[PDB]
C-alpha cells in the first residue's frame, strides 16, 4: 500500500510516455524488486494508469564514485554491510524505466496511451 520508489523524470518517447523510477538503499535491503515486463499501477493527479517495466540500469546518484568506493572497500578487506553501513548507503540505488500503457475506465472501455 506504499509507493515502490521515487519518480525522478518523465518524458514522451515516440508515441509513448515514459517515466524514470529510482529504488533506494532501504527498499533494496528490504528485498523489493521489479521484474522486467511486470505490470504496475501509476497514480497521477487522482488517476490510475497501467504501466510496464521496460528497462533497468545502475547509475550514480549525487556526487559519488561507486567504482572507486567499491574497489577501495574490496582492496582494504572492508565488509560494507557490517563495517561501513554509511558507505553502502550512498551506492545502493537502482534505476528503472516505466511506460504508460493507458488508463482503465470503470464502467467503460480501456483508454490507450495518454496526452497528459
Amino acid at each position: 500500500e506504499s509507493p515502490i520508489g521515487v519518480v525522478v523524470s518523465s518524458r514522451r518517447n515516440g508515441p509513448w510516455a515514459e517515466l524514470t523510477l529510482v529504488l533506494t538503499p532501504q527498499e533494496l535491503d528490504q528485498g523489493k524488486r521489479l521484474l522486467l515486463g511486470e505490470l504496475v499501477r501509476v497514480s497521477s493527479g487522482g488517476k490510475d494508469y497501467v504501466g510496464m517495466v521496460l528497462d533497468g540500469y545502475y547509475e550514480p546518484v549525487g556526487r559519488s564514485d561507486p567504482t572507486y568506493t567499491l574497489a577501495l572497500a574490496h582492496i582494504n578487506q572492508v565488509d560494507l554491510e557490517k563495517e561501513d553501513p554509511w558507505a553502502r548507503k550512498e551506492v545502493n540505488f537502482y534505476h528503472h524505466r516505466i511506460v504508460l500503457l493507458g488508463r482503465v475506465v470503470q464502467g467503460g472501455l480501456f483508454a490507450p496511451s495518454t496526452r497528459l
Binding site: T69, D84, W86, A87
Partner: protein, 358 residues
C-alpha cells in the same frame, strides 16, 4: 571511507541554546514595522560606484615576480557615468615594504589618475596619511585591501568634487558594500562622516551577503510578508552579528555600520528562500523617510539577474571586472617594454627565470 571515527562522543548539547537564541532574534524581528514598498513612489536617480581587482599568475606563491590590477568604475543610471581609474601595483616594487609606496604615488610629479584621485580625496576630506594607521603597513595582504578601500573612497570624493560640482545635489550615490571601513583609526571615520554630512551626500551602501550574516534571518518572516516592503534591523540583531564577526574573523574592529541598516524586499516570487532581498546602510544624517525613498529607488532599479539584484550595481560590476587575458597580455607587454628599454641579455635572463618558475 572511514566514518564512525567522528561519531563517538558527539556532544550535541549546544543546538538547544543555538536555536533558543535564533528564536529570540526572530521574535525581535517579528515586532518590527514593515513600511509598504508598493511599486509607485517618488525616487531619486542613481550613481553606482564599484571596484574590482585582478592578480597576475604566481602573485600568492611568488608576489615578488607578479603584480596586481585595481579598477574603479562608476555608472550613472545608464550613460552619465564617470571615467575609470586603473592602477597596476608591482609585487616587488615597494609593496614588500609598504609606507613608502603611498608616499611615492601621492608625490607623483605626473599625478596619474590614481594619484590625482587620492590627492583630491585627502585635501577635500581633511584625512591625512596618518589616519590610515599602521594596519596597511602590516604586510602586502593588508596593503592590497586597504589601498582598494581608500581608492574607492577617493574615487567617490573626486567624482563629487571635480566631475559633478553641483549635479550631485540631485543624485542618490550607491556604493557597493557596507558603509564601514576597517583597518583605520577613528579619526579617519570621523573625517569621512563629517565631510559627508557637510556635503549632505545621499549615500547608501548596498550589500547582498558574504561577511558573517545571521542578519539574513529575514529569509524567515519574508514568507507571509505581503510582497515588497522596507524594515529596519534591530539593535540586538546588529550587536549579535557584530560580536559573531569579531569572534569569527578578528581584525574586524571597524565593521559597525556608520549609520542605520535597512532591509527591503524587491521580489515577491523567488524560487528560493533568500532571493530578491536588498540590505542598505544609510548615513547618520538621514531620517526614516529617506530610507523609504531609497528603498523606492532600489525597487525602481530592481533586476532579476543574480536573484533580485539592484541592476546598476551589476552593470557597474560588469565594467570594472578584469579578464585574465588582461593580466596575461600585461605580462607580455611588460616583458616587451623591458626588452626595448634594457638589454636583450637582461630581458632573456628575466624570461629564463619566468620559464624556470611562475
Amino acid at each position: 571511507l572511514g566514518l564512525k571515527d567522528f561519531l563517538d562522543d558527539l556532544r550535541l548539547d549546544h543546538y538547544q541554546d543555538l536555536l533558543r537564541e535564533l528564536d529570540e532574534l526572530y521574535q525581535k524581528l517579528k515586532q518590527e514595522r514593515q513600511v509598504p514598498l508598493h511599486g509607485d513612489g517618488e525616487a531619486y536617480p542613481l550613481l553606482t560606484l564599484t571596484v574590482d581587482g585582478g592578480e597576475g599568475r604566481a602573485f600568492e606563491e611568488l608576489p615578488l615576480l607578479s603584480f596586481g590590477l585595481v579598477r574603479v568604475a562608476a555608472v550613472g543610471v545608464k550613460g552619465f557615468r564617470l571615467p575609470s581609474i586603473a592602477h597596476l601595483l608591482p609585487g616587488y616594487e615597494v609593496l614588500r615594504d609598504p609606507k613608502g609606496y603611498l608616499e611615492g604615488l601621492l608625490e607623483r610629479s605626473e599625478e596619474s589618475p590614481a594619484a590625482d584621485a587620492l590627492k583630491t580625496f585627502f585635501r577635500a576630506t581633511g584625512i591625512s596619511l596618518e589616519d590610515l594607521g599602521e594596519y596597511y603597513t602590516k604586510d602586502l595582504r593588508a596593503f592590497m585591501g586597504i589601498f582598494r578601500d581608500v581608492l574607492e573612497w577617493a574615487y567617490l570624493v573626486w567624482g563629487v568634487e571635480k566631475v559633478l560640482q553641483e549635479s550631485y545635489k540631485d543624485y542618490l550615490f550607491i556604493k557597493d558594500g557596507r558603509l564601514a571601513q576597517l583597518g583605520v583609526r577613528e579619526s579617519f571615520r570621523s573625517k569621512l562622516q563629517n565631510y559627508f554630512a557637510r556635503k549632505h551626500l545621499l549615500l547608501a551602501g548596498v550589500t547582498k551577503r558574504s561577511e558573517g550574516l545571521t542578519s539574513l534571518v529575514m529569509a524567515r518572516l519574508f514568507a507571509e510578508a505581503r510582497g515588497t516592503f522596507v524594515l529596519q534591523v534591530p539593535q540586538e540583531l546588529m550587536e549579535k552579528a557584530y560580536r559573531y564577526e569579531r569572534q569569527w574573523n578578528a581584525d574586524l574592529e571597524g565593521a559597525f555600520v556608520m549609520g542605520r541598516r535597512y532591509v527591503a524586499r524587491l521580489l515577491e516570487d523567488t524560487f528560493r528562500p533568500q532571493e530578491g532581498v536588498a540590505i542598505f546602510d544609510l548615513p547618520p544624517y538621514l531620517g526614516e523617510e529617506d530610507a523609504v525613498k531609497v528603498a523606492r529607488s532600489l525597487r525602481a532599479h530592481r533586476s532579476v539577474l543574480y536573484g533580485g539584484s539592484v541592476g546598476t550595481v551589476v552593470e557597474a560590476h560588469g565594467r570594472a571586472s578584469v579578464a585574465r587575458s588582461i593580466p596575461r597580455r600585461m605580462e607580455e607587454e611588460i616583458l616587451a617594454r623591458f626588452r626595448k628599454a634594457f638589454g636583450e641579455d637582461l630581458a632573456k635572463k628575466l624570461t629564463e627565470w619566468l620559464r624556470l618558475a611562475d
